[PDB]
Amino acid sequence: QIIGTVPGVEVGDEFQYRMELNLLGIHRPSQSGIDYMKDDGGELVATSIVSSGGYNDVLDNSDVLIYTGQGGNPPKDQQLVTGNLALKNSINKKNPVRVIRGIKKNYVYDGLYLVEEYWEETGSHGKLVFKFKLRRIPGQPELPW
Amino acid sequence: QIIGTVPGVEVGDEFQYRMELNLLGIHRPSQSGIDYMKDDGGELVATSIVSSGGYNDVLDNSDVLIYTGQGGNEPPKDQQLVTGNLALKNSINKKNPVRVIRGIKKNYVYDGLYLVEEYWEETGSHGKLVFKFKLRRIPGQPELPW
DNA sequence: CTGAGGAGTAT
DNA sequence: TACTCCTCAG
Numbered sequence: 001q002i003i004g005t006v007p008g009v010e011v012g013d014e015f016q017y018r019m020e021l022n023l024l025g026i027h028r029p030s031q032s033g034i035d036y037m038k039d040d041g042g043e044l045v046a047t048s049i050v051s052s053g054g055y056n057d058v059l060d061n062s063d064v065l066i067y068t069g070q071g072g073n074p075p076k077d078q079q080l081v082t083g084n085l086a087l088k089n090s091i092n093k094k095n096p097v098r099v100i101r102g103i104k105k106n107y108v109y110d111g112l113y114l115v116e117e118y119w120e121e122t123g124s125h126g127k128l129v130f131k132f133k134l135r136r137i138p139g140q141p142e143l144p145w
Numbered sequence: 146q147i148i149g150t151v152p153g154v155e156v157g158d159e160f161q162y163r164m165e166l167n168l169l170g171i172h173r174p175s176q177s178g179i180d181y182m183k184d185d186g187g188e189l190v191a192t193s194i195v196s197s198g199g200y201n202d203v204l205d206n207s208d209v210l211i212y213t214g215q216g217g218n219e220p221p222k223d224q225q226l227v228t229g230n231l232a233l234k235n236s237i238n239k240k241n242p243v244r245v246i247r248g249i250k251k252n253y254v255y256d257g258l259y260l261v262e263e264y265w266e267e268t269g270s271h272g273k274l275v276f277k278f279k280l281r282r283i284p285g286q287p288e289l290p291w
Numbered sequence: 292c293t294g295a296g297g298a299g300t301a302t
Numbered sequence: 303t304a305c306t307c308c309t310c311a312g
Contacts, residue, residue, distance in 0.1 A: 019164040023162075031306040106309095162299085174309075175296085175308065176309080177310095178297040202297080212297095229296095
């Protein structure tokens with residue numbers, strides 16, 4: 001269970017299945033978008049996220065990615081737990097997070113990002129949603145095509 | 146999408162994930178226990194099943210395996226002769242080979258080829274219908290290790 | 292699109 | 303047993 005770069009996985013490498021990512025140690029969960037671990041200490045820190053579709057993530061062609069937290073979608077408030085919490089803790093720990101994007105081979109490794117901040121939003125249903133702003137660490141290869 | 150043996154996959158070969166089976170063309174669905182195709186030409190025929198646990202099915206030490214159909218088990222309801230279930234039934238008369246993968250306490254073994262000998266329906270206490278398929282291992286194949 | 296479906300893993 | 307940015311055939 002590694003943090004940051006994973007041996008033999010280059011930026012721009014592609015995959016067909018979420019489990020391929022598991023087999024290479026890029027991202028362990030088969031569905032959950034957020035993957036994390038426990039630090040020397042006690043706390044959770046994120047190690048990787050997958051942005052397909054589903055949650056209304058804001059990504060385009062920039063170094064910034066807005067990622068939605070998990071939970072609640074009968075709708076209910078999201079909770080600062082598990083993945084969500086892991087990500088928040090990654091803000092202060094300032095650790096690298098692997099990012100995989102889904103695509104219209106359905107997944108690309110997009111390199112390393114840092115969690116700059118988070119905040120909460122309110123849909124019309126009235127329920128709470130977390131948003132995490134991640135920025136791509138400078139200096140890495142760009143994406144093909 | 147092949148019927149019967151798949152190139153380079155030997156009886157007793159093991160796997161950790163349902164998707165490994167997909168990558169090799171042994172079994173395509175990621176969760177659904179039954180995999181099938183359309184015959185020429187052409188109704189549904191089963192091509193592979195996965196027996197883990199969950200659907201209470203009978204996997205003793207023999208050449209015979211009783212496999213439960215999918216559906217109804219959330220509120221219980223009759224299973225339907227559709228998709229996989231139907232595919233299996235049609236494999237009875239077509240008499241085509243079916244690949245069988247067993248889960249294990251690497252979590253999956255390729256167990257070779259079987260034929261669907263018959264089916265029938267059962268009734269749980271809930272009152273709803275469940276299908277059962279009797280499959281028999283085609284003679285002459287390697288045995289399982291351990 | 293839509294969700295049925297012998298998943299996968301931590302908790 | 304909870305949970306979950308799955309996967310693909312209808």
